[PDB]
Amino acid sequence: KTKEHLMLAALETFYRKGIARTSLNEIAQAAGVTRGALYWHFKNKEDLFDALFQRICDDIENCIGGSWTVFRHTLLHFFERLQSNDIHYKFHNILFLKCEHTEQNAAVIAIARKHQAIWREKITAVLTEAVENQDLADDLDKETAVIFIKSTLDGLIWRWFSSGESFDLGKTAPRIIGIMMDNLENHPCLRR
Amino acid sequence: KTKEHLMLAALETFYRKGIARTSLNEIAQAAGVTRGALYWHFKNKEDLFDALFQRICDDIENCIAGGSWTVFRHTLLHFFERLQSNDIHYKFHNILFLKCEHTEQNAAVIAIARKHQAIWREKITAVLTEAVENQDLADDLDKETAVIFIKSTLDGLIWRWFSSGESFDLGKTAPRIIGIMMDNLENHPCLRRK
Ligand SMILES: C[C@]12CC[C@H]3[C@@H](CCC4=CC(=O)CC[C@@]43C)[C@@H]1CC[C@@H]2O
Ligand SMILES: C[C@]12CC[C@H]3[C@@H](CCC4=CC(=O)CC[C@@]43C)[C@@H]1CC[C@@H]2O
Structure with missing residues (x-):
């Protein structure tokens, strides 16, 4: 029951050509199945992409x-x-x-x-639990903190990919996270 | 001159269809000129893109005071x-x-x-070096990391604002982000050489 094989074929084709230029025919041909076999598991491009997104979010929460x-x-x-x-x-x-x-x-x-708003929710919850446990201040502007967290992480990812991975992410990521963590805990500009 | 018209028509077409699906034919059409009149001024889509990037870079470098x-x-x-x-x-x-x-x-x-990124990376390195010499930044500052920090911080704000459909006030968010980032560049020990 390996609907997983069809996901990984879409992942390879999205990777090679981008999503706009990837056709269902291409994915089926890459997965070595008929359009009909692909259709039984995924109606169209969106559900392939939604399912890959779910696999990513599931690996994280595991x-x-x-x-x-x-x-x-x-x-x-x-x-x-x-x-x-x-x-x-x-x-x-x-x-x-x-x-x-x-x-x-x-x-x-x-x-x-859709997954962005899920992730915003998981962040808003972590921020609230942290306020309650006294890791963050009670006047933390949680809404701007959520934007702050997302921007920080988005920028490192975007920078690393868009530069062709020209820097050592293993060295650089803990320092970016370390700073952002310190700012959430301490910087006045993140409060109301 | 007439280069300006062709360049705006490229910018509109890139904004409508993205760079990959835009054709030189469409840009000519949008601009009201023949294919040959465009080719004289710009040999390909890459030249138009390059022209637009330079004009953006020129705008920024002008507003310095x-x-x-x-x-x-x-x-x-x-x-x-x-x-x-x-x-x-x-x-x-x-x-x-x-x-x-x-x-x-x-x-x-x-x-x-x-290529324009590298220009901007050297412009950032120069601002950091001046600020060290001035002692706005510690002489100990890790300049290589700081440049990645600056680009990644700013890139992240831009990416966030555009990709979310501009669902937050950049006018109020950006000053806070810039203030935190510059605080960190002066004070955070993670941006020093040891
Ligand atoms: C930043 C991000 C949204 C927020 C995600 C982040 C991956 C790490 C992460 C895991 C969580 O448990 C909360 C949300 C966050 C913090 C995502 C990577 C790309 C996406 O834009
Ligand atoms: C972050 C960035 C590179 C660095 C640029 C930045 C725009 C503002 C700017 C102006 C300068 O004076 C130096 C370079 C910087 C700081 C650019 C926006 C997109 C690009 O990735």
């Missing part, structure tokens, strides 16, 4: 003392896996570099926005 | 203000971050973008 400490470990492990896990590597490379916000990709981009 | 590290603060704030208020800068950076897939077809356009 790998999951203290809530704020766990969060630190989650961000660190994320950038490790970006380097050592080929699916995580190729998926985020697609998300940041091969997903033009065109009207051809409108439904893929709605999918991505 | 206590202490040059505090000037850096200003030009950074002016960048994010221009992004929200200037149509060419908004469209151009939208195309750069959202409509420029890294396929084999765009590789020449990406090379052009990497």
Whole structure:
């Protein structure tokens, strides 16, 4: 029952050509099946992409003392896996570099926005649990903190991919995370 | 001259269709000129892209005017203000971050973008060196890491704003981000050489 084989074929084709220029025919041909066999498992490009997104989010929550400490470990492990896990590597490379916000990709981009709001929620919860445990201040502007966290991580990923991986992510990621963590805990500009 | 018209028509077409699906024919059509009149001024899509990037880079370098590290603060704030208020800068950076897939077809356009990145990396290194000499930044500052820190911090704000459909106020967020980032460059020990 390996609907996993069809996902990995879409991942390879999205990786090689981008999402806009990938056709269902290509994915089926790459997965070595008929259009009909592909269709029984995934109606169209969006559901392939949604399912890869789900696989990524599931790997993250699997790998999951203290809530704020766990969060630190989650961000660190994320950038490790970006380097050592080929699916995580190729998926985020697609998300940041091969997903033009065109009207051809409108439904893929709605999918991505859907997981963005899930992730915003998981962050808002971590921030609230951290306020309660006294890791963050009570006047933490949580809404700007969520933007702050997402921008920081997005910028490192975007920088690393868009530069052709020209720097050592294993050296650089802990320092970016270390700084961002310190700012959330201490910087006045992140409060109301 | 007439180069200006052709360049705006390229920018609109890149913003509508992205760089990869834009044709030189369409740009000519959009601009009201024959294919041969365009080719005279711009030999290919890459030349148009390069022209637009230079004009953006020229705009920023023009708007330069206590202490040059505090000037850096200003030009950074002016960048994010221009992004929200200037149509060419908004469209151009939208195309750069959202409509420029890294396929084999765009590789020449990406090379052009990497060339302007390197110009900007050296411009950042020079601002950091002046600020060290001035002692706005510790002489101990790790300049290589700091440049990646600066680009990654700023890139992340831009990516976040464009890819989320501009669902937050850049005018209020960007000054906070810039203030934190510059605080970290002066004070955070993670940005020193040891
Ligand atoms: C930054 C990001 C959204 C937020 C994600 C992040 C990956 C790590 C992470 C895991 C969580 O448990 C909370 C959300 C975060 C913090 C994602 C990587 C790309 C995406 O834009
Ligand atoms: C971050 C960035 C490179 C560095 C640029 C930045 C725009 C603002 C800017 C102006 C300068 O004076 C130096 C370089 C910087 C700081 C660019 C926006 C996109 C690009 O990736």
